[PDB]
Amino acid sequence: EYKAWEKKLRANEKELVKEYTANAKPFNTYLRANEGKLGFKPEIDKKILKLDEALKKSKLSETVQVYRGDDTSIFGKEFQNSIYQGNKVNRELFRKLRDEYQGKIRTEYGYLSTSIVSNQQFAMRPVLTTLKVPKGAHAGYVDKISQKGQYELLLPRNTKYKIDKMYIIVNKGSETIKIEATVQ
Amino acid sequence: AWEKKLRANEKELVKEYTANAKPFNTYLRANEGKLGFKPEIDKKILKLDEALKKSKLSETVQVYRGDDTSIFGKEFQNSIYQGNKVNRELFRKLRDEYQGKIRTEYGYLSTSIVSNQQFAMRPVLTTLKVPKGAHAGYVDQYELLLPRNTKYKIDKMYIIVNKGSETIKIEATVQP
Ligand SMILES: [Mg+2]
Ligand SMILES: [Mg+2]
Numbered sequence: 001e002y003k004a005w006e007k008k009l010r011a012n013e014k015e016l017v018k019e020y021t022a023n024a025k026p027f028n029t030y031l032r033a034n035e036g037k038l039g040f041k042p043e044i045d046k047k048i049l050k051l052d053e054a055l056k057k058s059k060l061s062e063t064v065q066v067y068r069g070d071d072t073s074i075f076g077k078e079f080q081n082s083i084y085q086g087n088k089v090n091r092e093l094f095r096k097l098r099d100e101y102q103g104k105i106r107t108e109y110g111y112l113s114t115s116i117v118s119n120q121q122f123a124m125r126p127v128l129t130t131l132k133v134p135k136g137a138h139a140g141y142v143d144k145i146s147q148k149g150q151y152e153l154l155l156p157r158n159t160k161y162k163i164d165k166m167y168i169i170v171n172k173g174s175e176t177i178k179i180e181a182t183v184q
Numbered sequence: 185a186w187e188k189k190l191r192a193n194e195k196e197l198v199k200e201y202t203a204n205a206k207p208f209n210t211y212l213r214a215n216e217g218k219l220g221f222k223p224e225i226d227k228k229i230l231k232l233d234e235a236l237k238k239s240k241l242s243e244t245v246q247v248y249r250g251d252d253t254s255i256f257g258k259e260f261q262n263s264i265y266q267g268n269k270v271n272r273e274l275f276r277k278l279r280d281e282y283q284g285k286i287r288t289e290y291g292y293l294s295t296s297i298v299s300n301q302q303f304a305m306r307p308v309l310t311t312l313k314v315p316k317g318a319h320a321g322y323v324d325q326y327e328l329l330l331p332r333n334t335k336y337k338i339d340k341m342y343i344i345v346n347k348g349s350e351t352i353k354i355e356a357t358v359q360p
Binding site: 012015016018019022023024025026027029030041043044071072073081124125126145147 | 203206207210222224252253254261262263265268303305306307349
């Protein structure tokens, strides 16, 4: 399916997709800073429009499960340093986070790169999100820049996802905040 | 086999940095390498500092790391590339800003050693000469971890023109 998408892309689109995957943070910090709206730096806007179009030429062949690790900063300043107390999740504060989050639809302003489980799921960061991406969704497989697994699944910017469930996974020497979500 | 010299919790913290280095380094960069805006993180950082002091390179080595263009700041990060190429005029300015100068890396400085391959798919590729006698610990295919606030002189900066891309190359020497 990496091959099917690649055959649909122009030469400049392939270059651009690779440019993004290898240099993702500056694209995504720009998008997040402006809540997914363009017009702030017209030059990067030009690339973003082309990357959007490249991704529109992709269509997922079947429904798939993918995942993302994140640190606690994705929750904002109030939760970032208070959601963990030492190595355990703050139970009272988690309650507040879950009520704030669960059942609701969120938007990721940046492009959404996700990993695919082969024989392993790399869940060492404090937050783990699994996402169900429906058949037919715009989503393209890309070369992973960690040379870990071969491919990642790249979703459009402004992806909307519903948080279906949220809970704490208690491990032997850590606790993980687990987010289960479905892409709209 | 530097692991022998480490206390128990020192090994554990090296492990924790491995599992999630981004909070450490983001914190350190945001505070320009000064503690301590956030006391609980500072306690870990101090322990990790101690662990790294317990190692010493017996010989000078070459290491490398790839980076995204955010290391050049907001005014360059999204303009230094145009049309899959490095903008030459902006690169002149960037080179003027950095080449020949001693920089401080506020975060810990994770680096890779070339065996068979050098993974340089990221737009920036930095190679560093790390001198004999430098504090630097080997951690888990192993990476070399240098202390925070490592100073390095940028010796040369140039654009490597590849078949299908351009790479910003930075060649640096770690200072004592
Ligand atoms: Mg554990
Ligand atoms: Mg190339």
